Write a protein that binds this DNA or RNA. Structure first.
Ligand code: MG
Ligand code: MG
Length: 115
RNA sequence: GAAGACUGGAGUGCAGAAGAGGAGAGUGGAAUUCCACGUGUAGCGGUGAAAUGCGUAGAUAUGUGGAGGAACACCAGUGGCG
């Protein structure tokens, strides 16, 4: 019995996580690639992202909602599968906003690999 | 070498110009970490594959607030100063 939810998709090189929340920040249900029962490196596949997004949409619809807002972060490739699954589950999306955090030359990054 | 004479060298005068040149004091935003509190449940992280590791004493995620330190995205350019 909540409308106007928000979806947070965190898709990285190793996993993807979908958070469904109210318009304020209180979570309702969540689903991750490993929560579906997947193995390790297989979590990065966009197929697992599609499955996780479908599961999150179904769990959100169990309590019922109509519209949704999409926030984007992470460098993973499971983004498109997640957003298309959210579209196909019956939820309309007002807009997609990217919230990938970029610093203004803040803390130094860890050293490059194979050195 | 000595005594004179002259401005091309050199320097001063007068009028403008540009610059991350140097020292001192104060301030700003983005982000990371830690702490406290709401929502929420079983994984998160990582790799060529894994595992050590954190997590039901309740993470990862998300919202609010607080503490502190370091570095200054776009401008940015075989551009500039020494
Ligand atoms: Mg001259
Ligand atoms: Mg938190």
């Amino acid at each position: 019995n909540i409308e106007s939810g928000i979806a947070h998709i965190r898709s990285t090189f190793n996993n993807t996580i979908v958070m469904i929340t109210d318009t304020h920040g209180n979570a309702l249900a969540w689903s991750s690639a490993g929560s579906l029962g997947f193995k390790g490196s297989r979590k990065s596949t966009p197929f697992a992202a599609q499955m996780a997004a479908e599961s999150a949409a179904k769990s959100a619809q169990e309590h019922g909602l109509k519209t949704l807002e999409v926030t984007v972060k992470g460098p993973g490739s499971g983004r498109e599968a997640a957003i298309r699954a959210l579209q196909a589950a019956g939820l309309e999306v007002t807009a997609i906003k990217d919230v990938t955090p970029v610093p203004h030359n803040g803390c130094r990054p860890p050293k490059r690999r194979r050195v």
